[PDB]
Amino acid sequence: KHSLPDLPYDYGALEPHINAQIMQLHHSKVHAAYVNNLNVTEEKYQEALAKGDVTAQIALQPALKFNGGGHINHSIFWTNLSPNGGGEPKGELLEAIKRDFGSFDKFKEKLTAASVGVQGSGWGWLGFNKERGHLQIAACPNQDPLQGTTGLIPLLGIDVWEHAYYLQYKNVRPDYLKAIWNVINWENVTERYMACKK
Amino acid sequence: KHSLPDLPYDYGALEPHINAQIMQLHHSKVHAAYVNNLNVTEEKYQEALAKGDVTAQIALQPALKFNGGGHINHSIFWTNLSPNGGGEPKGELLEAIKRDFGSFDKFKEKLTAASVGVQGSGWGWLGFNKERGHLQIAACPNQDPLQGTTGLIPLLGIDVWEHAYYLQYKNVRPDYLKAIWNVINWENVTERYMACKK
Amino acid sequence: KHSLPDLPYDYGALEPHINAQIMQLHHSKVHAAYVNNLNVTEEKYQEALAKGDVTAQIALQPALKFNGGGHINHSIFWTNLSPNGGGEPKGELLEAIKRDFGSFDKFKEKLTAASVGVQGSGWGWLGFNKERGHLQIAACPNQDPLQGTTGLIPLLGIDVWEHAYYLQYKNVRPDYLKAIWNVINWENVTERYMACKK
Amino acid sequence: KHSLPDLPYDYGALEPHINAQIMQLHHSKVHAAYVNNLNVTEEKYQEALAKGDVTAQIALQPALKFNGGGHINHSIFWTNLSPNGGGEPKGELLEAIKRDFGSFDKFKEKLTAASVGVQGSGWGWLGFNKERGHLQIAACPNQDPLQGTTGLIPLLGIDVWEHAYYLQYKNVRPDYLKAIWNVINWENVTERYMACKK
Ligand SMILES: [Mn+2]
Ligand SMILES: [Mn+2]
Ligand SMILES: [Mn+2]
Ligand SMILES: [Mn+2]
């Protein structure tokens, strides 16, 4: 059974960058629903699979990708943030960012560009391309997860669904992007990067 | 030059169903941006068309559908609402709804179902199918407009992008759907229906 | 385990409308590959689901929909055709057609148009909408199956992938559509209709 | 007005790798139809844009991308091939390849895989990412053009629509891919590369 992970910090720990109301709803309501809905969807698919009902399996795909991706995405997202986040990464991760994007600041502009560019709901990602052996930026629609749909290993995700910023930044998504850099947990992003170090 | 239409009522005229803050931002900020961005996009396409630059024309499609659809959708939406809305339609429109959906209440449940079912950003629509000569319910993603992408003539649209309800109803989209029925301008929906009366 | 069904007739039974080379290749190579790949994909999904590996489940969706859809679609297609087919249907089906499309000829026009309209690979379908309780024509891309993706019940499908007609009709898909009417198994289409209209 | 370019060689010049019947049909019928439909669609767009008819502009997008993309893609494809082609490229291009893909053979493996991987109709491409300043392989569905939809610059395209190989290789797309390497115009691919790498 999939389960809702606890936040690594309190709901108001990312203030004033992301306020407590957004965090509380985002975790206890939005993420929570994806987990429960994912479990329900998985149970329906085992039944469909057991009966060899291909039509049912296909009909369940949107729910599985949506709720499953929702669980995958938010689980990573919480770990990507920290009250003591911000600044820049060091060592290998930093060198890779410099190598692949020119400089840390350029990288921030490129991931900001990808995140602000999402039309409708979605996510901006810094991922790792195993085949090419380098970092790569990508944007995903709705809850479509990065690895499941592109093969890239997620390192840092920026949720740009309106439920992630509208209460506080209203329609000005760039203000939200501006603020989130202050709470990025580069320690976690570095750990995920080193995890694909092969 | 496309322009931002004035609202047919004040920003707080739909209270308590849709609060003033949502309306003020939705119209003066969200719709406004689509109009300006649409004008910019159209100007780029005339240049691309004049030079016969097919690649540029294709690259501009997402911006044109997104901002153009945004303008089309919101323009219709404002006219679909009224402080003195609610209740049920009469005459032909009502008979068609009964004929095509069984009853007015069933119709409300079906359009509610379509609207709540949108994964991510989008719209729920009651449209008119000219070929079949009957009403039809459809859901559209992001700002993809009803007529431009399905051929159905829009009669009533329900915006389910989070910027349309999150500030007030948070993650509970069904509460928003529950409330909006109280401000539907059936007089306008009837006018649009009679407009395809041929 | 899914299996390749035998054709209900000889590979050259549909001559001269659909030649024997196309039929033999379509059944013994094309459909067979979808069956094989479906079995492979389904088993990978069994493992992924057992491990609660959401990323793997999602990554397998394109292969499951494509190959699963391929199996569903071609299985129905073989039964929709017959060496003694052609002409028009009778009874309730014919009544539904004239009623929902005006006449049999207008119906041919609509389904032909939907099939010829597919850009790229896909299928044209005459289906049954259990919700509205009436017939409905739809087009599906690649191997996306009718019921699994639209909820409509398949009654008659027209495969417009190039492998279904290139060898014989070359780029003239309209000639292929005109010819296929001569081999439609209306008896089978009637069964499928009476089956969901109980 | 867009025009159908003459082929840079005889229809049977690529024998036995791609037969003359496929070449003649592909150029004189398939590509020709895209050109004709593109001109028709572009003119309708001129009218729609002049009237500020956003709905019509949006409704025309599928036809413009499909036919416009068709023209762009096939125009490049003819130049990427040659009767005296085959072998490997030299100089900077070859350096970029081994560098970005490991070796020429690994590159063939990657592009072949991308091309054979297309489910339904589409293209496999070796492109140039001006942003990262390196080569990049991508697959595009139907006639969606490489630059217009991904921003990457096309260097070499492999058409994997069934009309490009069914007549000769039947359902065995891998045999088609193996054969096409013998006619790649590396001289042309080099030009396109040096052109965007200025
Ligand atoms: Mn979220
Ligand atoms: Mn809106
Ligand atoms: Mn087929
Ligand atoms: Mn082609």
JSON list of N, CA and C and ligand atoms in Angstrom, two decimals, chain A residues 26 74 159 163, ligand 1:
[
{"chain": "A", "resi": 26, "resn": "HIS", "atom": "N", "xyz": [-1.39, 21.69, 0.29]},
{"chain": "A", "resi": 26, "resn": "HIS", "atom": "CA", "xyz": [-0.65, 20.93, -0.73]},
{"chain": "A", "resi": 26, "resn": "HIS", "atom": "C", "xyz": [-0.31, 19.52, -0.28]},
{"chain": "A", "resi": 74, "resn": "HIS", "atom": "N", "xyz": [5.11, 14.70, -5.91]},
{"chain": "A", "resi": 74, "resn": "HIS", "atom": "CA", "xyz": [5.07, 15.40, -4.63]},
{"chain": "A", "resi": 74, "resn": "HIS", "atom": "C", "xyz": [6.03, 14.80, -3.61]},
{"chain": "A", "resi": 159, "resn": "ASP", "atom": "N", "xyz": [7.09, 22.54, -8.83]},
{"chain": "A", "resi": 159, "resn": "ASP", "atom": "CA", "xyz": [5.66, 22.35, -9.08]},
{"chain": "A", "resi": 159, "resn": "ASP", "atom": "C", "xyz": [5.07, 23.68, -9.52]},
{"chain": "A", "resi": 163, "resn": "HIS", "atom": "N", "xyz": [-2.19, 25.44, -7.63]},
{"chain": "A", "resi": 163, "resn": "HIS", "atom": "CA", "xyz": [-2.41, 25.17, -6.20]},
{"chain": "A", "resi": 163, "resn": "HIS", "atom": "C", "xyz": [-1.11, 25.29, -5.43]},
{"chain": "E", "resi": 1, "resn": "MN", "atom": "MN", "xyz": [1.21, 20.02, -6.60]}
]
